[PDB]
Ligand binder design. Structure first.
Ligand SMILES: CCCCCCCC/C=C\CCCCCCCC(=O)O[C@@H](COC(=O)CCCCCCCCCCCCCCC)COP(=O)([O-])OCC[N+](C)(C)C
Ligand SMILES: O=c1[nH]c2cc(C(F)(F)F)c(N3CCOCC3)cc2n(CP(=O)(O)O)c1=O
Ligand SMILES: Oc1nc2ccc(-c3c(Cl)cccc3OC(F)(F)F)cc2[nH]1
Ligand SMILES: CCCCCCCCCCCC
Ligand SMILES: CCCCCCCCCC
Ligand SMILES: CCCCCCCC
Lengths: 141, 50, 51, 138, 164
């Protein structure tokens, strides 16, 4: 019983591994940042460039997930994925600098730690939900 | 009423998962794979002579 | 005849399938493609963890 | 029940996508957009192949037109090979089914029985004014 | 390092391609008869055990080539020659061309093998359902092993020619 919704769930299953790897790298980069002459600077600009270039794909791919679900008519899952898209739309993010960070070695580091851990938990839970949905739609044949 | 036909109901006859391979027999696909490996190795060998 | 039919009248209304290729004919190539992307993403992480 | 004998209609626009069902077309679109993004991610784990250039490569490979560049890594090459196989099968399927459409034509009656005629209600059905065939329905 | 791997590959491939042709479990078909390349044998019938040969009578060329199963025989010969050439490279070393000769023998073996199976499968069909045994898959595994040891032999030759 192959169906468009089934294929979209399968494709999301493939992409969610990359979506997880991004947040794992973000966690490692934060842990490298927290434990700290110009060498420390060059380290902090390297990490800032890494984060700035890694932010956008993590948002665009989730945009694909929500778009695929909207266009495939799966609303119970699009409802799950809407709040994260809204947070990814810089709703809580202020307007200070284009990048996430000025070393900003302060409570901002703890906030980014907490939100990164939360994002990883959400990603893995959503991954397992996608796997279950795919198996349910296919095996039901 | 009247005398009427009676035939077995035609099943849905769902296609196989890998039904796209039918237009060519199993032997043709596997010999395609094996000729691919053979051609790759021969092209490599001929390319390299020192 | 009908109102007590054991087989019932499921899909009693005429249903004529179209002659277009349905997704059930070519589902195999979609399974292959999604599997290929999954394998590519396994190899592309093994290489990076190697370095 | 009397209806006009069904003849072939005037072929509407957007008929070129009849040989493949709508679900297949949607799956093709999203498979292309999935393959391109995966090829991008692969080429940016370990070659240019940014998103804008990877989308062009995938679209070029689907339309059978020669690719400008080719992946060099292994994981970038598995994706290329799989998408090549997929596009070959899909184009062969489209051409073959279109040939079937053009070769032998099947005409289907829009309406089969009176129950479906009541359900449809898109076609207007009328009796004679006054008579048994009219007074029966009252 | 790699010469030993080429030797073990050469003799394993020769062993598999001389077990493939001699034994008779190629094709399973109908009572169920586990066929072979030379001899057909019966199973689950009035007769069992002992068994009889095949009868093979310009399609005559196909019949004679399938009958006198030359191409697998030649594949076995070529694999053996490649094995002895790799053996003779260790002694009388620095010949620089015996190893390339081995690299060509181990590839001509693959080509003769694939002709052998194309001919066998083409003649076989000359409805009923059939299946393939383990002699067939020893042949198929010998082909793969032959091609791989061929590429390893050329790799060794190139490395040893660049070292000079
Ligand atoms: C000048 C610019 C565009 C051409 C404008 C066409 C006007 C003249 C044609 C009039 C006409 O026949 O209407 C027809 C086409 O009407 C359309 O809308 C054509 C669609 C092409 C627009 C751009 C395609 C995507 C852009 C590029 C994408 C990258 C009616 O079409 P319809 O309303 O969709 O109804 C479906 C018809 N059916 C019943 C047969 C399925
Ligand atoms: O006894 C009757 N016998 C009838 C026989 C016929 C027919 F068989 F067709 F000749 C018809 N027609 C129906 C349409 O085609 C032309 C005329 C009407 C009949 N009517 C009138 P009703 O009551 O309106 O059916 C009668 O009364
Ligand atoms: O001597 C031999 N050469 C061979 C080449 C291929 C095969 C084979 C295998 Cl290994 C698996 C499935 C089908 C096969 O035959 C095919 F032609 F491909 F259909 C067997 C062979 N034996
Ligand atoms: C009926 C004749 C039997 C011939 C079989 C001899 C071939 C065995 C393998 C030879 C390879 C060296
Ligand atoms: C019957 C399954 C084997 C088909 C293999 C198709 C791959 C051919 C491309 C090299
Ligand atoms: C360098 C060894 C070759 C391994 C793969 C070759 C397959 C024909």
């Amino acid at each position: 019983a192959f169906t468009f919704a089934a294929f979209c769930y399968m494709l999301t299953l493939v992409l969610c591994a990359s979506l997880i790897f991004f947040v794992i790298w973000h966690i490692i980069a934060f842990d490298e940042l927290r434990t700290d002459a110009r060498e420390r600077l060059k380290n902090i600009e390297r990490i800032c460039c890494l984060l700035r270039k890694l932010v956008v794909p993590e948002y665009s791919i989730h945009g694909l997930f929500c778009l695929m679900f909207l266009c495939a008519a799966e609303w119970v899952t699009l409802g799950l994925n809407i709040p994260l898209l809204f947070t990814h739309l810089w709703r809580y993010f202020h307007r200070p600098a284009d990048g996430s960070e000025s070393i900003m070695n302060a409570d901002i580091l703890n906030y980014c730690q907490k939100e990164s851990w939360c994002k990883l938990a959400f990603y893995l839970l959503s991954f397992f939900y996608y796997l279950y949905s795919m198996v349910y739609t296919l095996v039901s044949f | 009423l009247g005398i009427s036909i009676m035939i077995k109901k035609p099943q849905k006859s769902k296609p196989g998962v890998f039904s796209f391979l039918d237009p060519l027999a199993y032997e043709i696909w596997m010999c395609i794979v094996f000729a691919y490996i053979g051609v790759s190795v021969v092209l490599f060998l001929v390319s390299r002579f020192s | 005849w009908y109102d007590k039919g054991e087989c019932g009248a499921a899909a009693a209304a005429s249903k004529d399938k179209t002659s277009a290729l349905s997704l059930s004919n070519v589902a195999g190539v979609f399974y292959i493609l999604a599997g290929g992307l999954g394998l590519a993403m396994a190899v592309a992480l093994i290489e990076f963890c190697y370095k | 029940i009397m209806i006009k004998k069904p003849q072939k209609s005037k072929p509407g626009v957007f008929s070129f996508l009849d040989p493949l069902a709508y679900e297949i077309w949607m799956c093709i679109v999203f498979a292309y957009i999935g393959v391109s993004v995966v090829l991008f991610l692969v080429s940016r784990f370990s070659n240019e192949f940014g998103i804008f250039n990877s989308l062009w490569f995938s679209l070029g490979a689907f339309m059978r037109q020669g690719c400008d560049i080719s992946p060099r890594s292994l994981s970038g090459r598995i994706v290329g090979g799989v998408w090549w196989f997929f596009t070959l099968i899909i184009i062969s399927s489209y051409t073959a089914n279109l040939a079937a459409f053009l070769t032998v034509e099947r005409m289907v009656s829009p309406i089969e029985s009176a129950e479906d005629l009541s359900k449809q209600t898109e076609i207007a059905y009328g009796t004679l004014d006054s008579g048994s065939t009219k007074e029966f329905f009252r | 390092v790699q010469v030993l791997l080429t030797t073990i590959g050469a003799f394993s491939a020769f062993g598999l391609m001389t077990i493939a042709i001699s034994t008779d479990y190629w094709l399973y078909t109908r009572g169920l008869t586990h066929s072979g390349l030379w001899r057909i044998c019966c199973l689950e019938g009035l007769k069992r055990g002992v068994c009889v040969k095949i009868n093979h009578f310009a399609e005559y060329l196909l019949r004679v080539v399938r009958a006198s199963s030359i191409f697998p025989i030649l594949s076995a010969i070529l694999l053996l020659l490649g094995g002895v050439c790799v053996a003779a490279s260790r002694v009388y070393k620095s010949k620089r061309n015996i190893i390339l000769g081995a690299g060509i023998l181990f590839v001509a073996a693959g080509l003769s093998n694939i002709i052998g199976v194309i001919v066998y499968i083409s003649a076989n069909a000359g409805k009923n359902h059939y299946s393939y045994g383990w002699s067939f898959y020893f042949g198929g595994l010998s082909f793969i092993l032959a091609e791989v040891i061929g590429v390893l032999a050329v790799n060794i030759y190139i490395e040893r020619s660049r070292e000079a």
